[PDB]
Write a protein that binds this ligand. Structure first.
Ligand code: AJ5
Ligand code: ZN
Length: 209
């Protein structure tokens, strides 16, 4: 039931989405090992993901979290990178998109830094890089990220020195780097229904000059 609508680069929605991409790149402590070396992206396409069934699944859960949290969904827009992006846009987030060995427990991870999500585009740790060149820093091959609507409800705050249940009380976990003062948060949900993949972003990382 999914349809994809191209946003025009002249459209203001294309532009605020690109801005959130570009403005949340940071340097990474792995020197670019997982996601490659770059400061900015070349944005190639931005599509809006439309699936009535997945949307209702999301808003139905959103209402429930909302009611449990002093009428507050605590709804964010957050990046998600994964080899399973084409499956997510068609069938939604589920247990199979969960990071079993994740630091904040076994759920689905999202990132405020788009460059954090880019590290996972070719799998945990960048896997072996693009399918074509086996290059985690490939500047040629087209990559895809999702920019997603995520319901956090009451988030459990977990300071970090950088499918399970949420801790009782909580609808999600915030993993908040405490050492790297420029690293933004990651969040973990334990139910697929708590994220909708609104935008599919197709891009290349750009070689620095
Ligand atoms: C035991 O393996 C079973 C198969 N599953 C995967 O191969 C898998 C699971 C999770 C992820 C994953 C992880 C963490 C992030 C974070 C932090 C940010 C983000 O944007 N995406 C993530 C994506 C991946 Cl790539 C693969
Ligand atoms: Zn490549």
């Amino acid at each position: 039931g999914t349809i994809l609508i191209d946003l025009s680069p002249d459209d203001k929605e294309f532009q605020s989405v690109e801005e959130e991409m570009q403005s949340t790149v940071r340097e990474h402590r792995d020197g670019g090992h997982a996601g490659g070396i770059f400061n900015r992206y070349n944005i190639l396409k931005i599509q809006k993901v439309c699936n009535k069934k997945l949307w209702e699944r999301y808003t139905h859960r959103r209402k429930e979290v909302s009611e449990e949290n002093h009428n507050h969904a605590n709804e964010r827009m957050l990046f998600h990178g994964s080899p399973f992006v084409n499956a997510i846009i068609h069938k939604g987030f589920d247990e199979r998109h969960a990071y079993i060995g994740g630091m904040f427990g076994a759920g689905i991870y999202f990132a405020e830094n788009s460059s954090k999500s880019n590290q996972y585009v070719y799998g945990i740790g960048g896997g072996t890089g693009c399918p074509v060149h086996k290059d985690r820093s490939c500047y040629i091959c087209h990559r895809q990220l999702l920019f997603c609507r995520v319901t956090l409800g009451k988030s459990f705050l977990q300071f970090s020195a950088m499918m399970a249940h949420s801790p009782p009380g909580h609808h999600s976990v915030t993993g908040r780097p405490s050492v790297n003062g420029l690293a933004l948060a990651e969040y973990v949900i334990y139910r697929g229904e708590q994220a909708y993949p609104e935008y599919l972003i197709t891009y290349q990382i750009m070689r620095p000059e």
